Each structure stands twice: as C-alpha cells, then as structure tokens.
Design a protein around this nucleic acid. Structure first.
Lengths: 141, 124, 185, 55
RNA sequence: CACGGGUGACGGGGAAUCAGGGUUCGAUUCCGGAGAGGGAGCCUGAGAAACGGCUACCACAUCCAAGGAAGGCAGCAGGCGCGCAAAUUACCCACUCCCGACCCGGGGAGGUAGUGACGAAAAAUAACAAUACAGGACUCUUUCGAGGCCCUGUAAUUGGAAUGAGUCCACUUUAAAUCCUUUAACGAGGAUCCAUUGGAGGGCAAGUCUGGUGCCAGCAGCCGCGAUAAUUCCAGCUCCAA
C-alpha cells in the first residue's frame, strides 16, 4: 500500500477498484466487449457450416501449408478459420457440412505455426474427426 | 437348525398386539419363507398362526442372519381393525380392487364433465 | 424437493506434482511391498494420514489443559488404539506425528491374512478375500479395505460356507468327480 | 496446395498388428511391474539405463 | 458519489480454492420476495389484485354448419424451435405429510420403477505347485564349481484347486413389481468370459530400435521437430502415466 491512514479504507477501495481495470484478465472477464466479440459467446463448442477450405501458409522457420476451414456459425453467423488437426482429415470434410468447432487452449490466440487461426474442428456431422482418423466409424453417405 | 430370537419386545394394549424384531439364524441354507416363520412363531408363542403377521426381511451379507419385524394380534377382528389391507392381501383374507388408477382418473374426469344423474351411465 | 442426503466426500487427493520420480518410487515400493491394486489405494490412505496428522497439528497448536484439546486428543488416541496402528503404551498425542504410511498399511486385512499365514502370498490373500473363503466374527468379508481392529484381529479364520473349510467343494472338484464317475460308469 | 492431403498416410505401407499374449491387468500388472523393476536387478556401478533402453 | 445507466444481478444460509489475508459462483431441493406471454380491474373468501378464478386491450392460438363457442404446461411426463448442452407421453397413495363433512376418499406434493460415465464411494480382468534358468545372507576353494538349513523372479512347459460377469428353480424385497443378499443345477487355461485413454527431446516418466516420407505430409499448450541417417511425422515392437 501507499497511504497508511487509520480511516483510508474508502480511498484504498476506490484506488484498487480503479486499478483492477488495468489488468488484462479482469477487463476481459468484466467487460462485455470481449464477450460480444467472442464468436462462441463464452461457450466451449459451436456448430457451423463449412463454406470453403483454405490453405494457409505457415510462419517463421517452421513452414507448411496448413488446412483450415472457413466455418459460418449458426447462432451468430460469424466466420471462423478453424483448424483440421490430424493428417488426411480434410477429405472427410466437404462443402456445406455442419461441423463442431472448439478452441485450442490458449484462450483466443493463434498457436505455433498457424497464424491468425484461433479455433479447431472437433466433430464433423455428428461423427468425430478422431474416429474418422482412427477408422472406427464411417461417414454416412 | 433354524433359530428365531425376538428382540425389542413390546406389549401394545392400545394396538392390542405384541411386537418384536425377529432375528433368524439359518446356518448354511437359503431364506426361510414367511409361512415357516409364522409356523415357528406359532409353536413358540403357543397361539394360532392366523394372527401372526411378519414382514420386512433383510438378509445380512454372508448368509447366516436375517432381520425382520413382526406383530402378533389377539383376534382376526382386531387384525382387520388395525392391519393394512395390502398386508392382509399378502396372506389372502382380503382382495383389493382391480381398476387401475389411470382409468379411474379418466372415469372421474368424464363424470366431472357430464352433470346430473347420468354419471352412472357415463362410467362404464 | 426430494428426501435424500447429497452428502459426499472425496477420500483421495491427487498430488500437486504428477510425475515426481521419488514419489512414484515410494508409491511403487509401497504397492510392491503391501500388495495394492492401484495408486488411488495409496492416495486415499495418504489422505487419511493427512487428516490425522492435520488434526494432530491442530491439537498441538492448542494450549495444554484445554477441554476441546483433551477431548479430541483422547478420542483420536482411542480411535488409533481400536484400529491397532498405535501401541497401548504410546497413547500420547505428540507421538501421532511420528507415524507412517507403512504402519497404516500393515493393518489392512490383506496384510493381516498374510501375517497370520493362512494364505500363501499377499495377492493370494487378496484372491481369498475376493473368492470369499474367510469370515470375521461369523461375517464374510469380501472387500479387503476392512480395517482390522485389535480386539477382532484374533477372530479371523476361514468361513463356514467354504470349500477350503467345512463346506461343499467347488466347481473344479465337482467337475472332476463328475468326469471320474462318467469315466467309471 | 490442398491436393496433397494425406500424402504420407496414402504412400506408407500398412503393417498388420502382431499377435501377442494378453497382458495381465491391475494388481497383477503392478505386481509384475514391481518384479521387473526391483527384485530382478542388482545395484551396479554407473548410470542405470532405462526400461526401453536398447543397443 | 446523490441522481442517471448497465448487470450473463432475486437476496441469504451456503459451494470451490485455500498458510494468514482474500478470489470466484450461488437459478437450484432450507427461508423470505416475484409470477404464470405483457399490463390493468374485480367478485368470493379470514386470507388473492388468485390466473387447473373471472373481466377488457396487445401478441399467439383451437372447433365451426360461418350464427357462434373456447385457451393459458416458468406443474407432471411428452412435442417443435433454440441450441455445445440436459431423461418415460410408466406404477402407486403403501413410506413422509396435506385437505375434507374427515379412522374409510383424494393428492404428477411425495414415494417407487425406466434413460443416465455431471459427480461421489467400494471394486473384477487371477493365484498356487513342479521342471529349465538368473541371482542374494553362509562352509570350502586365489577363481572355476558344489550343498541348501533361509530364499525372489521369468517362461503358449504342465497340473489341478477356488471364485465371479452372465443364464436360472425358489425365498426375500414391494401397494404389485424391480435392485441387493442367500440358495439348487449350469458356467474359465490363447481362464477369447481378451481394458482402454494420452505420451515417449526438455518441462514431466518413458528406444538416438526397424521401414517409408524428405521445410511435402504432418508433430507440438511453450521452447521447438521435419530439406534422403526424424530419439518429436506415419506404421510394427517395447516402455511410461491412470
């Protein structure tokens, strides 16, 4: 503390109440701007519609062509670059398919070699991409 | 080898009965039936087995001890005075109704609509 | 509004660091010494030890000749005596803190059957507990988490309905007898 | 581009799973684990190699 | 710090994390407040601005013979939509209580069944013996080798002994059932009656093993791997965590 009076409790409370807003996590938790700008809306998963598939060039030293999907959500209609995690799992996703999109773990941040892509794909038309990669289930045709 | 002990013995004159907790020890066999329970309580208490109603057996783990509750009345008139009709029907001196509750609710709400003496004509 | 309890409590607490080499070494030695099933079987006894030692520290922080301190201390020492981990001459609340996980695991009924010697191994004793051949005071104990009391330690023997004791033989003996009578005629 | 999806998974050779005796589980698995950790080996001089260490 | 605005604010007893301090949630079985799509008004009645009460407007919506009548599931189940997201159009007043003219009748309050890996507790998927072997506390021998008074483990080498998942008489449980326990007769040697979920550079435990790819495909929460010798990719084996 800075002021050490005997009855400065309202001064300390008002000063800490004004200085909590300068923290990033407190502002992200207590203002509705980030919660409105979040396409999930404070959620963990969201269903959407595949509209196109984009090959994104990777970053710095590690170079690759990552396979992202432009997903248009249902509850907001916003468009998200979602990442297809496993190998060979882009061919399981076609145009105009309802896929499930979640975060990646860094709480809204592009991770590693993939620039500007925050989210990833979990399930593809009520069939998970993990099962499509393992070969346990079959895509309904 | 089936042994019946009676704990928590109580004489309820306001209920006109005796009551006890029955502990049945049966070494190396299955659960004895309520008919054999009533017979052994009859030959123990030297009374008629018609007023001996025993219910609620619980078998402990291992298979050598069961515990239930029992009461012994004085007469069948007193048993029908204060004894539940379902446990009377367990032994067979009473028969309850057979009309099920959903059809009874449907019949009651149909009789609620039609007003007059014709409710007997509405019901069945 | 329904009539039920909604009262539960986790008996185990996972450690803070998941992959400590010394902690995994100690738990692996504990299971390989006392015949346990997994790591939760270690962690729940570790958390009961945490409860007992935390209560002992809370009593030793209290002042001497305090009624709550003497009451809780005598109750905890009575519990330790009746579960049989602490000796009858060591019934003092200052000696609770010098007690160990191995002394808690020595009072398991699997370890008690192995120390009385009616079984062959610790895991074979657990096999006997599973297969229900033993009883404790005319009560079959199927679950090896039974805390054996010091008064009930000498009452551990084979059960009544048991092919290893005074009972009917089992499936393999009946099948061998049936095959022998079918081969004889 | 987007035309090389699943290239390595398409061009590698599929090797079938080798048959094997089924593993003991649970308390027997941890007992066998303790038996292959401690009571079989002896304390030798130098750095002790790992379980999967091969030459 | 009035007034004004916002709240993904009903308030509290409480829940999680916790040294001490605090931080977050609380709609949720206990109490108090508000209401039956939105307001407003009233009879009855001790108690209502009541909605399984009415009376007018807005929005939704049913049958009609076209004159009319009639509704309020944020109750119980159930249906559509919205969704990342959540169960049967079952049985009963027997357990706990309530109502009435009341010992008797009723109660989608409540209780019992069906789905259920939110979650909490216990806990199967084996053990023993014999042979070949690899070694530890002793006697002898400089080693090589021998003995077992005491041992520990491995091996589709072999052997019985025991039990449970399940099927299933019967008893018990219960308003009638269901589940638990007991009990006949069945039911295990690849005991096929087969346990998976993630990783193996560091954090953080675990191959510089084998084949292919060659800054491609892909791995990786962070640093970082991958340009024809990849301990980090894809597969086989092995190991590690639960």
């Amino acid at each position: 503390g800075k002021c050490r009076g005997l009855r400065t409790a309202r001064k300390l409370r008002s000063h800490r109440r004004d200085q909590k807003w300068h923290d990033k996590q407190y502002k992200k938790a207590h203002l509705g701007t980030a919660l409105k700008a979040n396409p999930f809306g404070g959620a963990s998963h969201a269903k959407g519609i595949v509209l196109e598939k984009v090959g994104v060039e990777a970053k710095q030293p590690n170079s690759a062509i990552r396979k992202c999907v432009r997903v248009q959500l249902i509850k907001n209609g916003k468009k998200i670059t979602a990442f297809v995690p496993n190998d060979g799992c882009l061919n399981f996703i076609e145009e105009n398919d309802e896929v499930l999109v979640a975060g990646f773990g860094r709480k809204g941040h592009a991770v590693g070699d993939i620039p500007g892509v925050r989210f990833k794909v979990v399930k593809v038309a009520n069939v998970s991409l993990l099962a499509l990669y393992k070969g346990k289930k079959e895509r309904p045709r | 080898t089936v042994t019946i002990r009676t704990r928590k013995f109580m004489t309820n004159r306001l209920l006109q009965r005796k009551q006890m907790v029955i502990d049945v020890l049966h070494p190396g066999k299955a659960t004895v039936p309520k008919t054999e329970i009533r017979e052994k309580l009859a030959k123990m208490y030297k009374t008629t087995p018609d007023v001996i109603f025993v219910f609620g057996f619980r078998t402990h783990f291992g298979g050598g001890k069961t515990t239930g509750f029992g009461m012994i009345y004085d007469s069948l008139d007193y048993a029908k005075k204060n004894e539940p009709k379902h446990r009377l029907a367990r032994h067979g001196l009473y028969e309850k109704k057979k009309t099920s509750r959903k059809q009874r609710k449907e019949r009651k709400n149909r009789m609620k609509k039609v007003r007059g003496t014709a409710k007997a004509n509405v019901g069945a | 509004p329904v009539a039920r309890s909604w009262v539960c409590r986790k008996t185990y607490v996972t450690p803070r660091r998941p992959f400590e080499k010394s902690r995994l070494d100690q738990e692996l030695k504990l299971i390989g010494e006392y015949g346990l099933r997994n790591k939760r079987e270690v962690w729940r006894v570790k958390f009961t030890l945490a409860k007992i030692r935390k209560a002992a520290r809370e009593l030793l922080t209290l002042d001497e000749k305090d009624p709550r301190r003497l009451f809780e201390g005598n109750a905890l020492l009575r519990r330790l005596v009746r579960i049989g981990v602490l000796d009858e001459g060591k019934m003092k609340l200052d000696y609770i803190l010098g007690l160990k996980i191995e002394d808690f695991l020595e009072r398991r009924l699997q370890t008690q059957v192995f120390k009385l010697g009616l079984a062959k191994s610790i895991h074979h004793a657990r096999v006997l507990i599973r297969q229900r051949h033993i009883r404790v005071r005319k009560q079959v104990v199927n679950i090896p988490s039974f805390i054996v009391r010091l008064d009930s330690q000498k009452h551990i023997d084979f059960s009544l309905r048991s092919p290893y004791g005074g009972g009917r033989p089992g499936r393999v003996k009946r099948k061998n007898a049936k095959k022998g009578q079918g081969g004889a005629g | 581009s987007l035309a090389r999806v699943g290239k390595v998974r398409g061009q590698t050779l599929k090797v079938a799973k080798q048959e094997k005796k089924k593993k003991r589980t649970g308390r027997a698995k941890r007992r066998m684990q303790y038996n292959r950790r401690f009571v079989n080996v002896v304390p030798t001089f130098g750095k002790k190699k790992g379980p999967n260490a091969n030459s």
